Design an enzyme around this catalytic site. Structure first.
Site, PDB file in Angstrom:
ATOM      1  CE  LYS A  36      -4.110   1.818   2.431  1.00 29.67           C
ATOM      2  NZ  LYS A  36      -4.016   3.288   2.213  1.00 29.67           N
ATOM      3  CG  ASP A 116     -11.850  12.545   1.962  1.00 27.05           C
ATOM      4  OD1 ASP A 116     -11.982  11.624   1.123  1.00 27.05           O
ATOM      5  OD2 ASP A 116     -12.073  13.746   1.664  1.00 27.05           O
TER       6      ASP A 116
END
Ligand SMILES: Cn1cc([C@@H]2O[C@H](CO)[C@@H](O)[C@H]2O)c(=O)[nH]c1=O
Lengths: 119, 121
Positions: A36, A116
């Site tokens: 990731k 976010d």
């Protein structure tokens, strides 16, 4: 399947070194099949982060309206894959910071389901 | 007193490394056969820091109903020790079985560290 809330906790919560990200990204299954590339961990209590769902309502990056910014800054760690990193030897730079977090919130109980940004 | 954290390390941590006689030697040497034959015991073959990090991983109910148990996201190398039927204190005898499984531990204190091994899954 894993719920979005549980995935948020696995990916982003560490209520709580240069190798912090190397150890944590592996321990959270974020290096299992691929590295990731970017990830943030939040070092506040679960309760303090869930309370963000009652704080400043702001637009989500994807256009949705269920995002919330923390009123206060929070202790976080940014993990970003280095320029040299090749799976399966995932390598990360660890950077500590104190910043506001923005999360999307959903469900009952009403909790974060997506990170976010940090600002 | 031995702290709860140090006791967890003595009872359940073995990062150094399991033979067919591993449990017989280890249950004795970690003082788990001192007053009785401890019937079931798990040794974890991961770093102390990797095991300590489980206290921030998946929160799950403990077998006793308390809420302070945590399951590892990744599997970990462990050895389960289980008392045999022929075992008679003080000559405690164990079957040794290696596995790779998620571990569940109970955590307490400041720092928040493992104090009890609940189960493997
Ligand atoms: C089911 N189980 C149990 C144990 C030990 O047995 C006690 C039971 O009260 C616990 O406190 C552990 O010390 C273990 O080590 N591994 C395991 O899988």
């Amino acid at each position: 399947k894993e719920t979005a809330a549980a995935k948020f906790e696995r990916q982003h919560m560490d209520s709580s070194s240069s190798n912090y990200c190397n150890q944590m990204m592996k321990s959270r299954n974020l290096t299992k099949d691929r590295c990731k590339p970017v990830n943030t961990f939040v070092h506040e209590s679960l309760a303090d982060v869930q309370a963000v769902c009652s704080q400043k309502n702001v637009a989500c990056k994807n256009g949705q309206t269920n995002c919330y910014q923390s009123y206060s800054t929070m202790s976080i760690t940014d993990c970003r894959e280095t320029g040299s990193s090749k799976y399966p030897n995932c390598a990360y730079k660890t950077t500590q910071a104190n910043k506001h977090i923005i999360v999307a919130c959903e469900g009952n109980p009403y909790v974060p389901v997506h990170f976010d940004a940090s600002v």
